[PDB]
Amino acid sequence: PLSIAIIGGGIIGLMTALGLLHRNIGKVTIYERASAWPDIGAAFAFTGIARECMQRLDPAILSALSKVAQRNPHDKVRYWDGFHPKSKEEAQDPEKSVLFEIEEKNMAYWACLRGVFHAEMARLLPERVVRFGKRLVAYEDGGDQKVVLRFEDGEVEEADIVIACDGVHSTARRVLLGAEHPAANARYSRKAVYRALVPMPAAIDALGTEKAHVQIAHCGPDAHIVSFPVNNAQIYNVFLFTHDSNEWTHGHTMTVPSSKEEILSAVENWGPHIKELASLFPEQLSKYAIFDQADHPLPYYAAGRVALAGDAAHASSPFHGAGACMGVEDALVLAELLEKVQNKKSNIELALKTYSDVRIERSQWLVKSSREMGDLYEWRYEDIGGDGVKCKAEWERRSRVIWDFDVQGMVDQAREAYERAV
Numbered sequence: 001p002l003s004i005a006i007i008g009g010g011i012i013g014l015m016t017a018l019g020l021l022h023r024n025i026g027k028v029t030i031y032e033r034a035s036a037w038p039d040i041g042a043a044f045a046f047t048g049i050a051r052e053c054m055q056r057l058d059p060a061i062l063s064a065l066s067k068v069a070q071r072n073p074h075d076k077v078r079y080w081d082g083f084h085p086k087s088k089e090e091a092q093d094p095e096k097s098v099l100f101e102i103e104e105k106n107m108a109y110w111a112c113l114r115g116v117f118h119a120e121m122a123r124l125l126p127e128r129v130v131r132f133g134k135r136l137v138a139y140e141d142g143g144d145q146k147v148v149l150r151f152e153d154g155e156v157e158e159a160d161i162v163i164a165c166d167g168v169h170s171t172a173r174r175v176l177l178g179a180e181h182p183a184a185n186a187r188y189s190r191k192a193v194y195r196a197l198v199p200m201p202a203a204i205d206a207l208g209t210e211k212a213h214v215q216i217a218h219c220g221p222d223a224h225i226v227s228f229p230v231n232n233a234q235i236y237n238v239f240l241f242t243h244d245s246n247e248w249t250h251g252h253t254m255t256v257p258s259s260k261e262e263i264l265s266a267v268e269n270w271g272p273h274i275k276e277l278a279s280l281f282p283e284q285l286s287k288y289a290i291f292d293q294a295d296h297p298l299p300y301y302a303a304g305r306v307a308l309a310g311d312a313a314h315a316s317s318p319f320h321g322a323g324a325c326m327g328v329e330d331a332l333v334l335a336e337l338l339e340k341v342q343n344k345k346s347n348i349e350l351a352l353k354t355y356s357d358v359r360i361e362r363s364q365w366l367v368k369s370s371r372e373m374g375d376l377y378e379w380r381y382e383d384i385g386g387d388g389v390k391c392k393a394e395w396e397r398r399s400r401v402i403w404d405f406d407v408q409g410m411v412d413q414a415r416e417a418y419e420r421a422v
């Protein structure tokens with residue numbers, strides 16, 4: 001019975017494990033470095049396509065999402081100019097200050113918190129699956145015997161198949177390519193995000209009631225803001241994205257403390273309505289650096305009996321929806337290919353190589369485009385600046401690549417490519 005080891009029990013490793021279990025594939029173990037589930041505060045938007053894939057992995061995943069997720073009641077999102085308005089009245093005037101309007105019905109976002117979603121999937125696993133305190137630090141893959149896994153606690157395990165879902169700073173990715181391969185380390189994208197909860201009446205004062213009661217965006221030079229009423233409208237959530245003209249001075253460390261005054265200087269020259277909104281921010285807050293794999297995409301996702309999936313393979317900026325969206329497609333391809341293997345060593349190798357061959361172009365395209373979408377919202381992308389007609393045309397062309405996609409076609413293409421090679 002195929003021994004399958006999944007490295008890291010994040011969103012994609014859970015989905016990958018649940019997909020293989022749903023199909024009764026081999027024996028599945030998840031090795032998770034942390035002693036218990038890491039507490040990660042993060043907000044996600046899953047596309048309709050991602051949810052199709054969830055449903056094919058294990059319907060209970062989609063049932064779990066649908067009970068914790070919220071959808072925007074309005075399909076249309078207006079992108080407002082936060083920079084040029086000189087008065088609150090100009091800033092609220094849709095005829096003067098709306099750069100463009102996006103119709104999101106095709107993406108069909110569902111928003112949820114990573115923690116609650118992750119927990120709803122965790123309880124779907126049998127207790128025997130997850131092994132905490134198992135930080136993978138190296139492995140040996142070769143010869144006519146299982147992969148040998150080595151953990152930081154001195155223990156050693158073996159597996160026929162390794163799927164590394166160990167995140168943006170994947171250890172398995174560096175073992176696989178070499179710690180000095182250009183693609184071994186994800187890099188700062190130069191976008192950082194600050195988040196804040198602020199009282200609805202203060203938001204109303206700053207933005208006017210019509211803007212504050214719906215999901216909106218504000219664009220401007222080197223920054224953009226996403227903000228929306230929360231739950232029953234007693235509170236207003238603000239997501240402030242900023243470009244960094246400095247390189248990251250911390251390590252792989254992604255959340256660092258910052259003072260409210262980095263925010264204020266970012267929107268120093270913006271309309272009065274954004275300055276006032278930025279003021280409502282706490283004075284200590286956590287800055288989150290967005291790392292991705294745009295500068296040096298991986299040459300491949302698999303070698304021998306080891307495959308990378310999720311952020312370990314294609315960490316992405318969030319401007320086309322969660323980076324996890326592409327990881328869900330990885331998990332589905334992997335489940336469908338390993339089912340073929342079960343129904344040897346060279347079979348395993350071919351499956352993971354097929355996985356890589358079929359997933360790499362679309363997922364690396366997504367890393368590149370979501371990077372560029374962040375620049376567009378911040379008037380840094382090529383010539384376009386703040387031309388709203390050009391930004392809107394870019395949003396529609398890029399999003400169509402994502403949502404206008406044949407999921408069943410992907411499954412059948414991977415299964416057939418495998419069948420021919422075997």
Ligand SMILES: Cc1cc2nc3c(=O)[nH]c(=O)nc-3n(C[C@H](O)[C@H](O)[C@H](O)COP(=O)(O)OP(=O)(O)OC[C@H]3O[C@@H](n4cnc5c(N)ncnc54)[C@H](O)[C@@H]3O)c2cc1C
Nearest residue numbers: 008010011012033042135136166167171310311322323324
């Ligand atoms: C503070 C923060 C904010 C974020 N905000 C957003 C956001 O707004 N939008 C968005 O789309 N994404 C965001 N993310 C990223 C998002 O959580 C991930 O993209 C998502 O969970 C999919 O990643 P993944 O499953 O492939 O990897 P991860 O969720 O990162 O999971 C990897 C797992 O592997 C484990 N692991 C790591 N190294 C080892 C090792 N050597 N051995 C064993 N286990 C190991 C980790 O403990 C972890 O549980 C945020 C992340 C953080 C930390």
